[PDB]
Amino acid sequence: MEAVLNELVSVEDLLKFEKKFQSEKAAGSVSKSTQFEYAWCLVRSKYNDDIRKGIVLLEELLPKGSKEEQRDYVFYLAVGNYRLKEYEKALKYVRGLLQTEPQNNQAKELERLIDKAMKKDGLVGMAIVGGMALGVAGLAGLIGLEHHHHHH
Numbered sequence: 001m002e003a004v005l006n007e008l009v010s011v012e013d014l015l016k017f018e019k020k021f022q023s024e025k026a027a028g029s030v031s032k033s034t035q036f037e038y039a040w041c042l043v044r045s046k047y048n049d050d051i052r053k054g055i056v057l058l059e060e061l062l063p064k065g066s067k068e069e070q071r072d073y074v075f076y077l078a079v080g081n082y083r084l085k086e087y088e089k090a091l092k093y094v095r096g097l098l099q100t101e102p103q104n105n106q107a108k109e110l111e112r113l114i115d116k117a118m119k120k121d122g123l124v125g126m127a128i129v130g131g132m133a134l135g136v137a138g139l140a141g142l143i144g145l146e147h148h149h150h151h152h
Contacts, residue, residue, distance in 0.1 A: 014041045035061060036073070043080040055080045071100060078110060087114045 021038045024030045035057060042054030058073045058080075065073055074097050081090035091114045097107045125132055 008046050009041060009044050014045060017041045032061060040076065043076055051080050051084060082114055087118045090114050
């Protein structure tokens with residue numbers, strides 16, 4: 001029933017989770033739970049600097065989380081860096097993420113956007129046909145011999 005409304009994050013939802021971070025911190029301590037949900041609210045902020053902080057917030061929690069807890073935080077980091085134009089940074093988090101869970105399709109499709117975007121702002125070979133061009137006659141050849149190591 002989590003219907004995604006057409007809006008980033010109302011200042012109330014962003015500060016709402018910040019309020020908890022304040023009361024908990026006021027006690028002189030902060031539960032990692034708030035630290036995790038506090039970065040999400042920022043990672044989805046309308047300001048970029050808020051993400052630069054939301055990304056660091058999780059980056060410090062990863063070493064503090066186990067391998068499974070990291071698989072979740074790793075997922076948010078690839079999404080936060082993916083939008084900050086940083087395509088390779090998010091590509092390192094999404095690629096290693098598969099090294100752990102290759103059966104993750106949501107992690108695979110994201111890799112396409114990151115890798116596909118880079119080719120977009122790089123202009124591919126415009127019209128393509130099977131590849132950049134043909135080849136010096138070489139259909140199969142995946143079982144026959146190879147270049148004869150011998151001059152003439």
